[PDB]
């Protein structure tokens, strides 16, 4: 979608595995604030929006 009509989505009730992301692309941009990219697959969250 275009930026002026961005698309929200909710993610809950799953066993989240963050080890699938690295295998997508060279990831020209990949950043998280106050969240360690490497320590993400072991912490647990309530609800994840996308």
């Amino acid at each position: 979608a275009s930026v002026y009509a961005w698309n929200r989505k909710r993610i809950s009730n799953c066993v989240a595995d963050y080890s699938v992301l690295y295998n997508f692309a060279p990831f020209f941009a990949f950043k998280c604030y106050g969240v360690s990219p490497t320590k993400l697959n072991d912490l647990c969250f309530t609800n994840v929006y996308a």
Partner: protein, 50 residues
């Protein structure tokens, strides 16, 4: 911005009491890190304060 006070952001394991480390080796990623450059992870340990 004063970019002279920096702090370690990435390490393999937590450190023992009263222990100091100064090495600025490039941090590990899913795969062998790049080389002091961006990539899938291949991060750099130190971060400034600002």
């Amino acid at each position: 911005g004063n970019y002279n006070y920096r702090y370690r952001l990435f390490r393999k394991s937590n450190l023992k009491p009263f222990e100091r480390d100064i090495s600025t080796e490039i941090y590990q990623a899913g795969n062998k890190p790049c080389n002091g450059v961006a990539g899938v992870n291949c991060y750099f340990p130190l971060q400034s304060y600002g």
